[PDB]
Amino acid sequence: GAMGSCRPPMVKLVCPADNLRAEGLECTKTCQNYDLECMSMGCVSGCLCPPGMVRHENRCVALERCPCFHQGKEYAPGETVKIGCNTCVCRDRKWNCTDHVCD
């Protein structure tokens, strides 16, 4: 289940038999699995951004270009929201709060 398309072929990658070729690296990376181990891959052939990138919302972005996720809702990155008295700006996948406090 990947609800995707691959009309234009980039390159054909053939599944090995005795697995003595192992592509040439380890499992792929995603904004979620970047640090979360992937379960042994089963000849899952697919197309996507070249190596060194991660998958997000079917949109190809790099770990740096990965935005901040807000409870199912995704607000444009580099922007800010108000949570009570303290406010912060979405930068680097984590909340970057200004520095001041209301306590």
Q: Alpha-carbon distance 37 to 19, whole Å? A: 20
Q: Which two tokens stand for residue 11?
A: 């390159």
Q: Which two tokens stand for residue 71?
A: 């409870």
Please give the DSSP secondary-structure letter assigned to residue 11. -
**Phi, psi at 53, each rounded to 5°:** -120, 170
Q: How far from the centroid of its chain's Cα atoms is residue 87's Cα?
A: 25
Q: Return the residue matching tokens 């800010």.
A: 80
Q: Are 63 and 19 in contact (CB under 8 A)?
A: no
Q: Return the residue matching tokens 């380890």.
A: 26
By what method was this entry solved? NMR
Q: Alpha-carbon distance 37 to 96, whole Å? A: 26
